[PDB]
Design a protein around this ligand. Structure first.
Ligand code: HEM
Lengths: 499, 499, 499, 499
């Protein structure tokens, strides 16, 4: 035989075996006599408007496509569960961490960042690793990546960053001038750029990569006491990457390498797993941290803030219909149940708005009613009504204003957010200089060895060689600030490339 | 006490025993701690983006509205059943007519025509009377009106006719010049105009008016023999009309008079019903009919084509949530099950295209997936997939191309359409002069009495009086062609009006 | 001849006189041969898909409607100019106030609140009075009402209040229980309710009422000094209202009363104008104001904060096409040029988000590209691109990321917002008990005269009578809390109504 | 210094000499003070909703994407002109052919078929070659391909065909079982499958392939006489194809090979051109053609129906903004000016409906208002109005109903469609067995040589080898019907591949 993925139809047919074909109908449920020949006057005559079989089917075909995700368009999904294995109730009261052995269903979507829906999986790019927890207190979406950090630290630079990574607005071609002019002008990108151009830049499928929340988050316990945290979910299959050589080969031999790998792993029973950890920081410590605790361009040293086990994530089910279950999947960082709150991270703050907003556009106003997006483990009861494609019963005839004297849904005091104190002027504080090299120099010296640093520079130079000399100069100058050797090596490569 | 419509909330309240009210949540199912006070920095400080309770609720409120129907925007709905009382299987093989006593659930929506969603019920205008039969062979939508005829007989004049009935493109005001310039210029409208301005122009609610399929349709039997027909559903409540004075009064007194009437009636167990009849014309008869059997401005004389009893239409269930079950209702004339087909009526032909089209716009590509529009009494299976707001399971992993060797849905030759022969050039044949008066004269002097011919001419003059003199002149000419008296009478009234 | 509005087409034909009427075409610009008859095979044959003239027209007709505004759906628009008459330069550096006599084009839309698109103009309800200033520093949208205050003072309560003012979720009928239960439970609305049921409750058209920014705003001068302010625009044609009985008759005789009045006033050269004033309050004063200066339910006493003249608002141009210039008009309170900023008013803060949001839904992502919404006196230059229905050149080939070394647009520090210092815990502060009767007492006793007080209570009782008894009790209990005579006078009339 | 495409930004920067950079504004035209830092309370405080610069920008970024084309999603565009070189006014009265030398502006888009927006250009697949002619009689869209024929001859199988060529609905992977099951079940696909797997399957860029209307169309002269025709635009650059190995190389090295090649060619002054010809068939010859002349799987032998020269197509201008000028480009086969009409081709008949339909979904109801889609060389004037994103003036205050007595646009008899007669039963005539091998045999034996037949069979086997054996067998059967050796040679390859 061949892989399970390849036998998808063969298997569907087999699953039906005995049963005979169902009757083919129009969208309105009308049986059709012949869906292979159009209705005309005479065998060589005109098509009739009276052929509603044709119109019904073609019209739907004409409307199959929806906008792809503005970012992370190319992805793959699966479903499974989360199981608590350690008690962290001292930090969070979230019913999802409620007690060891507690399992909560989950939905996951892996993806690249820049490429469109037709792009290849095995290419250098960060990797999305979004997890949706269907908890009793509604859904909790942990929208992380395969890296604990990011290129920028203020949401205002996000649209620009993404544009620099995508296509030139006139030629529609990738543009090295755009990529590096941006990166060279914004030195804060050094930390994640180093990671991206390291071996971890091209993971071997979605099962051999780590997942992180990246953002500092806030956990609150049953006492009302809070602590800041970081979510870490390490791959139990272990880290494994593709050489720049195999990745290019797979890019054309099988652009859906990641998708195929995941589906087959699950179909064969080789369920992928991750171990979820959290490193905790107290407000006292946060106020002492040598760096901005909420600066997305920085990590919390494992030595000072050890990883603590929380539970395990297992994907043991492939989607049945990809469009309905994966393409329409929607993760909102703002989706947080009692016990988990956001931090002041400027990037996370912006994401609180961005996701539901883009989901209302890409999917629709009632996108939370799409099966895979419904918090089906909780009871949605509120004063929201109508909107296009209003499914279910739209909460029936329940009073639609609050407060009301007719017993409609009520407050839940115990669900109040944790109160924190803040003081300062309301202004746009520049964070462009919040130390852009310190942690990068260490990544470059302690995280990577001599051979890894070797590839790191070859990959950077291989891409940067296409940018204008003045951009290469600014670019090199930045790497040099991190460490003189960092810049010198790349400059050496560029001198050769520039021949 | 008060009527049931007024105690809607009182009943919702008392029908929940002492049941503890539900927990107020976000669209994502997250419990809300306080949804009466926004999140700010200090008692008099600015609002935070972090307040996702606010954004989640406001963003949905911001998207509650959807485009109202392009016509028939103001209406009311109710649900019930259809019940066969006579065997007409000799004429049609449609499963809905299967056997005596067979019941099929129906959905109904009554409406005015020109007024927008905020308009008054008690106004002069035809009345939409659409019936959706959820049959085993899919949904059958009989999209009728409270009149057996219409103003025009070609779909190309429909948007123009509707534009003339609505608002002036610049002032946004009703424009008697547009109304009468169009009717005067197109005399085929005489018949229905005569009906509209007679007492039946303003029914007393929806329960006291008849329903008509209006168009000539085609019924096919098991033997494959065909015949043409007209559907008639007479009110078992009796014909009742509102006086011009009472209607004007109710316009401001109760703009939703029809809504209330229907809801309270069903709420008090006073279920309105209609008796469905059909007229039958053989193909032979159609070849010799003195008029075009498919001319929408003509009725079939009951003296040659008597009403044939079929079944009963009963409404005994009010909607629970109006937006979900009524505003979202979509009737498509093209939704016809085996045994019922369209005739060459040009207006009907046009409608085969228009309804599904506007629904894909007004509601969305997958509107047939909205609960009320779903053919839940049939098994929908085809090769259509995806589209925005895709609920269900999108037919899982079933093969999506036809034909296929994997046991997916198969068409069924039993559902093939009856075959009619046609010969002719592909041209735009004129129908503007297909006898515009013959049947109108008989309606004026043979169908109406003097007591109401007086009322007919008054109503017409009361409206026509505001169009320019040249428009009135022409309009009067048409009324004269029907009958010199008809014209003269109207002219006299106008003469007094013009002072 | 009749009134201008009535002669709209007559006048269109006249200005066209002598000109050969344009060739009618498809949306694609192809000339049409006969748009009055469909293409069929034979006179009484089937309609052809080949009839693309029919489809092009019918498909656009089927897509004519867009969702109506979620609130303020029924309205009227006009255009004109804003003229600076006085110098408020020491307060605001905004270019629109630059020099005495300076003219800035304006767009204005008047409207009711609860009624949908087809509702009547002359009904009890607040009046929208939105003004868009097309300034060199971009558009400034002063989205005002005919009242200085509002029913609530926290945005979270807005969707509920509107829900209570519209239709019952099941019956689709107006529901006094919903209306008064909400008002009963939230007494902060007493001030606006009192204003709403006074004679001002039903203005004689839009030309005889004042406008107000309602909210407290912030003005900043060239030196960086800020003050808080209130915007008031009083009518130059004087306050004039319709009696309950007069408004009621007009409701059915001319539901577009306001529309007609405005169009005719302008068409006949009787341009309506308003004088814009501001009240100023220094930061020191806001600090000692008897109430929360940012509470939308409070006004600023004229004796302590005199109206300071600013300029004139003149409407001298009617819309040419209503849908394009009025239905499509979008006002965003967040559209504020340098020199004008928001205050901490919680309601206003919520509005900063809501309008752009609903506009992207109702109109589309690029609604600011619709002519009437375009800041045509400014040069839009930024890093935003694409989106559905992208017009113009989408900023051509300009670098689309910021920062960049290719001279694309640059931010301007002078446009930086004014820095205010805020301190406090981050939480949901209860504002439900922020003095709900003080100014209402003054309103009832000092502002109104026995004559007015009389029918103010009769207006209230006439509507509150339909609510359930327990609701009437609490409502009266809130009026008595204002002034015993207020609540007692209501009770007397109620007792009577309950026969 | 590099290729023009690579220097896009450099050239733009240089094009703005010393001109000062524009001021950065919000969508509403308000200058932005600092677009690089968000508005927060203190340097490490929360984000404020008051930051309307952020929300304005992010909200638009969140809405950048629109559905990609259901098919032909990956493509490139350019602009230029059409020039008449020969006189064919004896066949067509279309203004575009009016006289020798006559120049008419054109827009062109090249594309692949199955791949999504991120897919590679150098892949085996047919190639789209749509040409939009902006004529005075409106736009004429000749939506062609790089092949004169297609896989199927009835539109009802188009959605299925495209589905079979796309991703598996469950695994989201290309599925050879789907591809070959469909093809093996529909042998009519043999002709185009043979052209597809030949050298032609992978042209070298877009400048080295021919164009074809594929369908048989109808031309009508000034005397009302009509002939059927075929459109052919041969590349003046000459046919040039990519080796299977070089295609897989560019597939990963430059997924945008075709995009780059075209832009550079035009940028460097090396304008690509095509010579336009027509094949003509009288109605008499049509009656005697050995095959259905309207059969899309058939070509008209050049020996019997010689190519007649008409003019040249030249592309001399690159788009400035790709999204606005190419991504939003909409071609409707139904856009045909007088003198050019459709034939009875069942496939073309379906396309008359599908394109404007999908465009109203992908782009919007008023997509014909997007600049690149407007028929700017004509005057659009009709009775269509409103719709979302209505630009310009919506035809102002012009009467909106037809007919009318107010001088609004009038139809033109000279534009009536040609008259053709048809007689026959209205039914679904089976065309599945309309000779599926005769011309395919001629192609395999006469058009190709041994060298080419060898590659053809290798290419087919290379893909077919991955489908199930039963599918392989049925597929080989069909090839054997074309020619015993055709099938045998492939079988030989298969046996090898099958291990
Ligand atoms: C200023 C900050 C950011 C903004 C405004 C932003 C915006 C977006 C948007 C608009 C989408 C598309 C959502 C959809 O269409 O469903 C997206 C997807 C995604 N983003 Fe971000 N993002 C930001 C930072 C990040 C960071 C730091 C991470 C990781 C912690 C992240 C991980 C992802 C992932 C994995 C997805 C794909 C989710 C899926 O598979 O459905 N984003 N982002």
């Amino acid at each position: 035989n061949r892989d399970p993925a390849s036998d998808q139809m063969k298997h569907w047919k087999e699953q039906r075996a005995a049963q005979k074909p169902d009757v083919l109908t129009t969208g309105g449920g009308n049986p059709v006599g012949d869906k292979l020949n159009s209705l005309t006057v005479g065998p060589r005559g005109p098509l009739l408007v009276q052929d509603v079989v044709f119109t019904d089917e073609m019209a739907h075909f004409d409307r199959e496509r929806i906008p792809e995700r503005v970012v992370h368009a190319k992805g793959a999904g699966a479903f499974g569960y989360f199981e608590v294995t350690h008690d962290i109730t001292r930090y969070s009261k979230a019913k999802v961490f409620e007690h060891i052995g507690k399992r909560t269903p989950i939905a996951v979507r892996f993806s690249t960042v820049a490429g469109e829906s037709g792009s290849a999986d095995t290419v250098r790019d960060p990797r999305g690793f979004a997890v949706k927890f269907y908890t009793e207190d509604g859904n909790w979406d942990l929208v992380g990546n395969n890296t604990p950090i990011f290129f920028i630290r203020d949401a205002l630079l996000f649209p620009s960053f993404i544009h620099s990574q995508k296509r030139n607005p006139q030629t529609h071609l990738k543009d090295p001038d755009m990529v590096w002019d941006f990166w060279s002008l914004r030195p804060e990108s050094l930390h994640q750029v180093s990671f991206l151009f390291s071996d971890r830049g091209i993971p071997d499928g979605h099962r051999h990569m780590n997942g992180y929340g990246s953002h500092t988050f806030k956990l609150v316990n049953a006492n009302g006491e809070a602590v800041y945290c970081k979510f870490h979910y390490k791959t139990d299959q272990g880290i494994k990457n593709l050489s720049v050589e195999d990745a290019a080969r797979l890019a054309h031999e099988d652009p859906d390498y990641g998708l195929r790998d995941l589906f087959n792993a699950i179909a064969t029973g080789n369920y992928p797993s991750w171990t979820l950890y959290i490193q905790v920081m107290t407000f006292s410590e946060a106020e002492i941290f040598p760096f901005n605790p909420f600066d997305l361009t920085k990590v919390w040293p494992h030595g000072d803030y050890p990883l603590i086990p929380v539970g395990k994530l297992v994907l043991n089910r492939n989607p049945v219909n990809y469009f309905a279950e994966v393409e329409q999947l929607a993760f909102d960082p703002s989706n947080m149940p009692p016990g988990i709150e956001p931090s002041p991270d400027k990037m996370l703050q912006g994401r609180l708005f961005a996701y539901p907003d883009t989901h209302r556009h890409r999917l629709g106003p009632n996108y939370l009613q799409i099966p895979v997006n419904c918090p089906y483990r909780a009871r949605v009861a509120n004063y929201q009504r109508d909107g296009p494609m209003c499914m279910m019963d739209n909460q029936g005839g329940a009073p639609n204003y609050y407060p009301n004297s007719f017993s409609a849904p009520e407050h839940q005091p115990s669900a109040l957010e944790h109160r924190t104190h803040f003081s300062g002027d309301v202004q746009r504080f520049n964070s462009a200089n919040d130390d852009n090299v310190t942690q990068v120099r260490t990544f470059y010296l302690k995280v990577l060895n001599e051979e890894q640093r070797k590839r790191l520079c070859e990959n950077i130079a291989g891409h940067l060689k296409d940018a204008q000399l003045f951009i290469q100069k600014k670019a090199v100058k930045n790497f040099s600030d991190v460490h003189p050797e960092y810049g010198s090596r790349i400059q050496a490569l560029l001198d050769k490339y520039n021949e």
